Amino acid sequence: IPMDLFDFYEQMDKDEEEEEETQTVSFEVKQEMIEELQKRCIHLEYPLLAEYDFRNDSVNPDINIDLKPTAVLRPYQEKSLRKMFGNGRARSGVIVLPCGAGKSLVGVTAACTVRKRCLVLGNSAVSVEQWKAQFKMWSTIDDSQICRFTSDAKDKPIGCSVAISTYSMLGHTTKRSWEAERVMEWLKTQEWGLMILDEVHTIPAKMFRRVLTIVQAHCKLGLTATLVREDDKIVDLNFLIGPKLYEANWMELQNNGYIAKVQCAEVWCPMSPEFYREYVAIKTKKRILLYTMNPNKFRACQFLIKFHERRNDKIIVFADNVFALKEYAIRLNKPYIYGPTSQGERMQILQNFKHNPKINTIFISKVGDTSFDLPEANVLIQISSHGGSRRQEAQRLGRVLRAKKGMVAEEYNAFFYSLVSQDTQEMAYSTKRQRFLVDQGYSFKVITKLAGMEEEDLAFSTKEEQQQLLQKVLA
Amino acid sequence: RLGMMRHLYVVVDGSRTMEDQDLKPNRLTCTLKLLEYFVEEYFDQNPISQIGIIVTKSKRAEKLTELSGNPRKHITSLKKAVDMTCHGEPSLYNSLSIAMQTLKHMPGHTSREVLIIFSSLTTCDPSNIYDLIKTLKAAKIRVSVIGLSAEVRVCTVLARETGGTYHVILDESHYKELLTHHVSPPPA
Amino acid sequence: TSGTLSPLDIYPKILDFHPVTMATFTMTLARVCLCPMIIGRGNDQVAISSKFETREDIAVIRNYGNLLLEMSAVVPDGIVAFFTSYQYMESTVASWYEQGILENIQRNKLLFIETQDGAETSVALEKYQEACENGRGAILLSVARGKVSEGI
């Protein structure tokens, strides 16, 4: 019976003396006792099923957060917190929802419900500042106990939620990675007990994974929309944070005056003289440019901007590369936003795009993703298949697009487009993209021709024009 | 069946409440569609007879068909009405006064009848409706109401005082049973 | 007697005596009656704490004012809304005559306030029986203690 049972720590492992012979592990591996990774503590179901239990004799009895107030979440979010009360730590650990519908609120509520000494992990200071703005109803004495805790200073019991910090490892002041042995876990090194991760996909990377791996970490919750990069690490995240409690929030459940119905499309474009000579012959990182700048595909992108500006729709055009961004945008004479565009000029372009009926198309680089209060529109065009994550295409779509007036309860009232050059490595991403979006509940189709592109003025009207671009791209 | 001749004024509720999806597609669509089925069955049972069609909508009365002995006008009018739908609130007093004016003219041995399909709860008319009910019973104009989910007392008294036919309809099957009871002739 | 009294105990409690008991009518099925309760329908419906129901504006505005309007507009029949006091009644229905500009029901209902008059009471019952939602016993507000309890 476990009334005497010691349990300890060695470098990243838990060893269990004079044992109760617990299920699901090897025995006398190198001594009479059981020995697991720290990170295996998460598997509380394997003892719970057996009817086994354990005690935290290493406890520290100091004080904790109360945060008694409540707020109202979306109908699926409220169902998702209600499930978490239901399931408990044996059968909980991540939630997936867009970066534009209430993820900050799920984190402050997840900490106010769970109610333990908490450390909040985030990607960015702006997101700490959005959390703070969310959290003001549960903030103790409004503004006299909230503080930041990162590379310049630390103070107070709370802040953006409870104490927030960043994932970073540049040196001794880049907080969570550097501090990962001092404070954090109620059962051993026992100052705190609860972990809330915003942007949770960020942690399972090869160096970062160690922050999570080198503890027992009692309670853990993660929140994300991108969830994984193109190589799919996500089997690891079940171990590292916990299993996935939720994924859906389909626009099928929020149509009539609520968000958008999006017609999704992929566009297959043919390939014009000289560009495949050179695509086929070049194996280097330049070849990404011959498939993206393919003038038949540029003419589809131009024709599509013209159709939706003729109807006065608002359009964001995404370009994965600053070269591509500027070659498309300067030719189409639409503003662009990227890293080196300043805050003053970005806020002028974005205010113009949202409120000026003359400024209806803009071009944007990777800086939106994971973070850029991206503005509202009704049309999204991606010039390329990229290598950022099929799941980030759906986060980006979801956070940017809304219903056009009048038509707020129809089958579709917003539009997404991804442009693909036929007979290239750009095509490989489609059978995955297509399966992903339809599994996310989206109506998605393939457009393979445009015989009305043969009825109007567009660029690249000759071989000589196309040759002028081909020489510039090759250089 | 032959023995006497009937005059019947079909009155339909074209208020905003008739748009509702409670009774197939919506009440307006289900009622006009079954009412077309009734006209042909009543005229087949009653070869020497007449009907006229009135609606109450947007706080007024309108004549969809004039009083006549050819069924074709009435099914063509029920077809033409569905497109223009229903909005607003009844005008029952003005509809019983135009119906009265046509029915008073008719000779001694023919019936005087008003059939009303009712999905409202009152009517917009200022005029004193009780004076007009007293006048219907003197004139021998009989008024029947088929109501949708509704027993509001002035309508029920108005159908009882004029002859005894306030009925409630809760399905498309029950409404076809009610119209088919009205297809049935009077004694002579 | 009092119509119903089946749990029996309160009368012997009040008497400090133990009468002979008897149930002396044949009753009808439960299905002719329906006795609902209302409190909310999603997990975000938190405005009904009623720690100070006489002061909780958000709670009066939310399902107390809003559920009444949903139920009355959907269920279009003659329906009387009973309140615990005049002050609640006045706050819940903005009416023609509002206690503030900030009150949360907009729909044709009739009032039943103090200085009720025996002749004036009948006018409101004539209106409710005749037609429309509104009248005495119809879409009208009355405090449950008040005279409307005599009925017609």
A310: Cα separation from own chain's centroid: 33
**Euclidean distance between the first and final Cα of chain B, in Å?**
11
The token pair at B59 is: 């706080």
**C76 touches B: beta carbon within 8 Å:** yes
The one-character DSSP state at C63 is: I
Residue found under tokens 């702006």: A126
Contacts of B154 in chain C (CB under 8 A): 130-131
Q: Are strands A219-224 and A361-364 parallel, antiparallel or unpaired?
A: unpaired
- Cβ separation C44–A72 shorter than 8 A: yes
Residue found under tokens 């299920």: A23
Q: Is A438 helix (H, G, I), strand (E, B) or coil?
A: helix
Contact between C24 and C5 (Cβ < 8 Å): no
- Cβ separation C44–A79 shorter than 8 A: no
Alpha-carbon distance of A20 to A53, in angstroms, equals 10
- Cβ separation A73–C44 shorter than 8 A: yes
A263, with CB counted inside 10 A (0-12, 13-18, 19+), is middle
Contact between B43 and B71 (Cβ < 8 Å): yes
A449 is in an annotated binding site: no
The token pair at A12 is: 């990243």
Residue of A nearest to C42 (CA): A75
Residue found under tokens 């009753």: C27
Q: Is A35 helix (H, G, I), strand (E, B) or coil?
A: strand
Q: Which of C124, C73, C72, C66 is nearest to C92 (CA)?
A: C66
Compute the residue count for chain A. 475
What was the elucidation method? cryo-EM
Alpha-carbon distance of C141 to C117, in angstroms, equals 16
Q: Which of B149, B20, B148, B139 is nearest to B85 (CA)?
A: B20
Alpha-carbon distance of C93 to C107, in angstroms, equals 8
Helices (H), A241-294: 275-281, 287-292
How far is it between the farthest Cα atoms of chain A? 86
| Among the partner residues C77, C129, C131, nearest to B122 by beta-carbon distance | C131
Alpha-carbon distance of A159 to A138, in angstroms, equals 10
Contact between C69 and C107 (Cβ < 8 Å): yes
* Distance in Å, alpha carbon of A455 to nearest chain C alpha carbon: 54
- Touching subunits of A (3+ CB pairs, under 8 Å) are C
Q: Which residues contact A280 (CB under 8 A, 6 or more apart)?
A: none
Residue found under tokens 């996909």: A201
A115 is in an annotated binding site: no
Contact between B171 and B26 (Cβ < 8 Å): no
Return the half-sphere exposure (C-beta side, CA atoms, 13 A cut-off) of residue B29. 9
**A63 touches C: beta carbon within 8 Å:** no
Contacts of C42 in chain A (CB under 8 A): 75, 78
Alpha-carbon distance of B54 to B118, in angstroms, equals 13
Contact between A89 and A143 (Cβ < 8 Å): no
- Cβ separation C132–B153 shorter than 8 A: no
Helices (H), C16-146: 57-59, 65-74, 86-92, 118-130
Alpha-carbon distance of A329 to A383, in angstroms, equals 11
Contact between A119 and A198 (Cβ < 8 Å): no
Alpha-carbon distance of A268 to A250, in angstroms, equals 26
Alpha-carbon distance of B150 to C36, in angstroms, equals 21
Neighbours of B40 (CB within 10 A): 14
Please provide residue A138's backbone torsions phi and psi, each rounded to the nearest 5 degrees.
Answer: -100, -10
Alpha-carbon distance of B57 to A122, in angstroms, equals 62
The token pair at C15 is: 């008497």
A98 is in an annotated binding site: yes
Alpha-carbon distance of B153 to B161, in angstroms, equals 12
* Distance in Å, alpha carbon of A68 to nearest chain C alpha carbon: 13
Alpha-carbon distance of B15 to B89, in angstroms, equals 4
Q: Which secondary-structure segment (H or E) carries A110?
A: helix A103-114
Alpha-carbon distance of A406 to A333, in angstroms, equals 30
Q: Which of A269, A247, A296 is nearest to A395 (CA)?
A: A247
Q: Are strands A149-150 and A153-154 parallel, antiparallel or unpaired?
A: antiparallel
- The sheet carrying A443-447 orders its strands as A336-337, A361-364, A315-318, A379-382, A414-421, A262-269, A443-447
Q: Which secondary-structure segment (H or E) carries C143?
A: strand C140-143
- Cβ separation C43–A78 shorter than 8 A: yes
Encode A28-62: b = buried (16+ Cβ within 10 Å), e = exposed. Answer: eeeeeebbbebbebbebeebeeeeeeeeeeeeeee
Residue found under tokens 């042909």: B40
Q: Is A280 helix (H, G, I), strand (E, B) or coil?
A: helix
Q: Which residues contact C101 (CB under 8 A, 6 or more apart)?
A: none
Contact between A58 and A190 (Cβ < 8 Å): yes
Q: Is A in contact with B (3 or more beta carbon pairs below 8 Å)?
A: no
| Among the partner residues A70, A75, A82, nearest to C46 by beta-carbon distance | A70
Residue of C nearest to B124 (CA): C132
What are the C-alpha distances in Å from B4 to residues A199, B46, B157, B185, B186? 85, 9, 28, 9, 8
Alpha-carbon distance of A279 to A295, in angstroms, equals 14
C74, with CB counted inside 10 A (0-12, 13-18, 19+), is exposed
Q: Which residues contact B135 (CB under 8 A, 6 or more apart)?
A: B100
Q: Which amino acid is at A434?
A: Q
**C90 touches B: beta carbon within 8 Å:** no
Question: What residue ranges in A210-307 does DSSP mark as E strands?
Answer: 219-224, 244-247, 262-269
Contact between B147 and B167 (Cβ < 8 Å): yes
Alpha-carbon distance of A109 to A79, in angstroms, equals 13
| Among the partner residues C76, C130, C133, nearest to B153 by beta-carbon distance | C130
Alpha-carbon distance of A116 to C108, in angstroms, equals 52
Alpha-carbon distance of A262 to A129, in angstroms, equals 31
Helices (H), A138-266: 175-179, 209-213, 235-240
The one-character DSSP state at A57 is: T
Q: Is C83 helix (H, G, I), strand (E, B) or coil?
A: strand
The one-character DSSP state at A358 is: T
DSSP sequence for chain B: --SS-EEEEEEEE-SGGGG-TTSTT-HHHHHHHHHHHHHHHHHHH-SSEEEEEEEEETTEEEEEEEEES-HHHHHHHHHHHHHH---S---HHHHHHHHHHHHHHS-TTS--EEEEEE-SSS----S-HHHHHHHHHHHT-EEEEEEES---HHHHHHHHHHTSEEEEE-SHHHHHHHHHHHHSPPP-
Q: What is the resolution of this structure in A?
A: 8.6
Alpha-carbon distance of A268 to A383, in angstroms, equals 11
A104 is in an annotated binding site: yes
- The H helix count followed by the E strand count for chain C is 5, 2
A100 is in an annotated binding site: yes
Which of A76, A78, A112, A253 best tests the C interface by mutation, with the highest count of C CBs <10 A? A78
Please provide residue A378's backbone torsions phi and psi, each rounded to the nearest 5 degrees.
Answer: -135, -5
Alpha-carbon distance of C132 to C76, in angstroms, equals 9
Name every residue in B having a CB less than 8 A away from some CB of C: 17, 121-123, 150, 152-155
Question: What residue ranges in A386-426 does DSSP mark as E strands?
Answer: 414-421
Residue found under tokens 């019973």: B137
What are the C-alpha distances in Å from C118 to residues A41, A185, C83, C109, C115? 77, 74, 21, 20, 9
The one-character DSSP state at A45 is: H
Please provide residue A97's backbone torsions phi and psi, each rounded to the nearest 5 degrees.
Answer: -160, 150
What are the C-alpha distances in Å from C144 to residues C81, C84, C108? 9, 6, 20
Q: Which residues contact B40 (CB under 8 A, 6 or more apart)?
A: B71, B75
Alpha-carbon distance of A10 to A12, in angstroms, equals 6
Alpha-carbon distance of A215 to A208, in angstroms, equals 13
Q: Is A266 helix (H, G, I), strand (E, B) or coil?
A: strand
Q: Is A204 helix (H, G, I), strand (E, B) or coil?
A: coil
CA angle in degrees (0–180, nearest 5) for B71-B24-B118: 65
Neighbours of B136 (CB within 10 A): 21
* CA torsion angle A148 A149 A155 A159 (round to 10): 40
CA angle in degrees (0–180, nearest 5) for A100-A103-A109: 150
**C134 touches B: beta carbon within 8 Å:** no
The token pair at A177 is: 């990675």
Q: Which residues contact A260 (CB under 8 A, 6 or more apart)?
A: A251, A378, A401, A402, A403, A413, A414
Residue of B nearest to C138 (CA): B152
Angle between helices B27-45 and B172-183 (to 10 degrees): 30
Contact between A264 and A442 (Cβ < 8 Å): yes
